[PDB]
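If your schedule permits, I should be very grateful for your opinion on a structural question. I have a record of one protein: its chain in single-letter code and its fold written as discrete structure tokens. Would you kindly read the sequence against the tokens and tell me how you understand this chain to fold? Thank you for your consideration; the sequence and its tokens are set out here.


***
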Amino acid sequence: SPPGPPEDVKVEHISSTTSQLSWRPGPDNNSPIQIFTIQTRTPFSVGWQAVATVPEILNGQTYNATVVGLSPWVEYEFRVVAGNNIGIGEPSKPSELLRTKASVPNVAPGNINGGGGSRSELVITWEAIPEELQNGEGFGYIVMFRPVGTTAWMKERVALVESSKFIYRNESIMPLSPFEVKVGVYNNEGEGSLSTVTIVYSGEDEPQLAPRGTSVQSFSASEMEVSWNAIAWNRNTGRVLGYEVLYWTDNSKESMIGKIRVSGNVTTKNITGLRANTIYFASVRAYNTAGTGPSSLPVNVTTK
């Protein structure tokens, strides 16, 4: 028969990314055990995970091993499942829950980006890392930036693992000035790794005027097509990168608002997935990296 569960699983010592385990074997069930497997479970874990050991294979006479590949400052518990050459035994009762010792963070955030804000702002955004990779207390992000062609990095720390936006303010800078930026990590244990570099631009002035000549037309029941005039550019109005089309309705089934953007010089947008035989309003506004300008005068139509 497959073996009974191992007994008295205890962590002798635990460090940052490893631990020392000891266990007693369970009943042999007439078939000599030749294999032991260790598994692990954390709060952020789904059930139990297999885990690597030193030795990389545990034989039936092995009642001790070091577990490798643990995440620093994470709460761990371990169980041991015995194994036969006839079946796979039942898993043991978990060790007394314990937290691994802290270490500096090893994983820089992803999707580093930014742009927008005012003419005297550099706005930097990243994706806040998984909570289990803080690896210690007092965790935060290291935002590093510099003008292109400058050598010295400027940097400023941002506490809390959930934070994901930094704004640098400096009246000296000009609109859409390029910057080199990268974001790293830190905690009470010191500074961890940084991200690769990408380029982010300073902000600019919002568009000042509203698009005119707004009209709507409907050919289908799922669709209405909004139109308007392109905004002429004079340097004292903002630059117009494109147009945002707002559309709302107030029917029996619901009331909703929708946003859809077009890029460049496109002055027509067919909106899809609409409700049949329904009153819809539209309204258009120009956008650039800094946000939107004023809305146009609304128009309306009715679906087929």
